[PDB]
Each structure stands twice: as structure tokens, then as C-alpha cells.
């Protein structure tokens, strides 16, 4: 499914992302927008032979297993296919582990390029 902006804000709130590792909920919503355009089924083949999966475009080299990626480590211990559903739980769980490493949200390339330092809270403004 393609989530609405305020709809995804709320799911992410209920899943404990607001202020997770100091990153406010607009951060997470802005990330989704520019990574997947709110589309839980989005998949993109990358220049290193890895693939990114799901609403937060979780990567198959470091975090999930798709069976076909060079130097994969599977640090989330999950199949990438399990991240393409309308339930964002597994993407969120993997997000929390990702953001707890050195890199913080800089692990999401669209976040660091389009979101970082911006009025990210505008992404959840007007939501209930």
C-alpha cells in the first residue's frame, strides 16, 4: 500500500519512533517520503549489487537478507521479503537497530540529502 502522510505519521508514532535516538517523528516521515514515496512495496536495485526494500528502503548488504547480495551481513536477522508488507513493524524494528549504530540516520541516503537540517516537523504538521 501507499500510505498517506498523516496516516504514516500515526503508525510510526504508535510504533515508538518519535524521538527514537533523538530523531523526531518528522525525520522518520520525511525519510519515508524521499526513500519510498510512502510505498510499502517499493524495491530498488543498487549500484553495489544490493537492493533496498520497503517503506524505509532497508538495505540487503548490511541489514536484511535477499540471498543475492555481495558481502551481506544480515545484521537485522530477517529476509528482505518480510519487509514488503502493509504492516510496518518489521521495517520499524530494523530501523531502530540501524539508527543505533555509529551513523544514526545518515544511514539513509535520501534522509541525509533531503531531510537532514530541514523543517522536518512540517512533515507531521496538521496530523492528529
Amino acid at each position, epitope marked *: 500500500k501507499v500510505f498517506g502522510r498523516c496516516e504514516l505519521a500515526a503508525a510510526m508514532k504508535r510504533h515508538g519512533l518519535d524521538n527514537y535516538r533523538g530523531y523526531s517523528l518528522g525525520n522518520w516521515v520525511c525519510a519515508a517520503k524521499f526513500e519510498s514515496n510512502f510505498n510499502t512495496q517499493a524495491t530498488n536495485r543498487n*549500484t553495489d549489487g544490493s537492493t*533496498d526494500y520497503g517503506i524505509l528502503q532497508i*538495505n540487503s548488504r548490511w541489514w536484511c537478507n535477499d540471498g543475492r547480495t555481495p558481502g551481506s551481513r544480515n545484521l537485522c536477522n530477517i529476509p528482505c521479503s518480510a519487509l514488503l508488507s502493509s504492516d510496518i513493524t518489521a521495517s520499524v524494528n530494523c530501523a531502530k537497530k540501524i539508527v543505533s549504530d555509529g551513523n544514526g540516520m*545518515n544511514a539513509w*541516503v535520501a534522509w541525509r540529502n533531503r531531510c537532514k537540517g530541514t523543517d522536518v516537523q512540517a512533515w507531521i504538521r496538521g496530523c492528529r
Partner: nanobody, 119 residues
Framework: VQLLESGGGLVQPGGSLRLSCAAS????????MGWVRQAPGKGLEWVSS????????YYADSVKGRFTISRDNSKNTLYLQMNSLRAEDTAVYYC??????????????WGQGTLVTVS
């Protein structure tokens, strides 16, 4: 930080070609790096990688056994040896790297690119 590819050119099928990539502004010897190409009217496609201090190499299936990726640490230069060239190997080739790993989007930094034409 900079990557700068040379020298593609025209080669007959069956021929060979060695590409280089002069690298600067970072610690070359242990950096994850690779080659990517963009063929006429297709997206960027991964070709090869070399990872970490071990220098573990990986290759896309269309090139395995024909290409070899190499580092020259003394000169901070990355090489791609291309043998047994075929018409479908025609593409712009790019040397590439991660700007801030671990990350998504694959390699996000690449050079200007060098053209290889195989006819």
C-alpha cells in the same frame, strides 16, 4: 574526495581493456569500492566490488571470469581488467564508493565515467 576514470576507447570483440580510477581524499587501502556501468538506454548496473582490508572481490554474473578488479595501494588507483569483450559490454564505466557506510542506496559517489565501445 575524488575518483577519476580513464581510458576506455574502442576495442574489437574478444579484445581486452584495462580501466583505471585515480582516487584521492580518503584512506584508499581498506575502502569498499567498485565499478558500475551504464549501457545505452539502461540504468546504472553493478559490475564488481572489492571490500575491506581483505580485498574480497565480487562480480556480477555477466562478467564473472572475464573481469578482474584490483587495487594498487602505492598509487591509490583502482583497476578493472576486462577480457573477452562482447558488444553488450559497451557502456560508460564508473568507479564508485560509499560516502558514509553502512548505508542504503549502494555506492553513492562515482566519477565522471569513461566510455567503452565494443564493435
Amino acid at each position: 574526495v575524488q575518483l577519476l576514470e580513464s581510458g576506455g576507447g574502442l576495442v574489437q570483440p574478444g579484445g581486452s581493456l584495462r580501466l583505471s580510477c585515480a582516487a584521492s581524499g580518503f584512506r584508499f587501502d581498506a575502502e569498499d569500492m567498485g565499478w558500475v556501468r551504464q549501457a545505452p538506454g539502461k540504468g546504472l548496473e553493478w559490475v564488481s566490488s572489492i571490500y575491506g582490508p581483505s580485498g574480497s572481490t565480487y562480480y556480477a554474473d555477466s562478467v564473472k571470469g572475464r573481469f578482474t578488479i584490483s587495487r594498487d595501494n602505492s598509487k591509490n588507483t583502482l583497476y578493472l581488467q576486462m577480457n573477452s569483450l562482447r558488444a553488450e559490454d559497451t557502456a560508460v564505466y564508473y568507479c564508485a564508493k560509499y560516502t558514509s557506510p553502512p548505508q542504503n542506496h549502494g555506492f553513492d559517489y562515482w566519477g565522471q565515467g569513461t566510455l567503452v565501445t565494443v564493435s
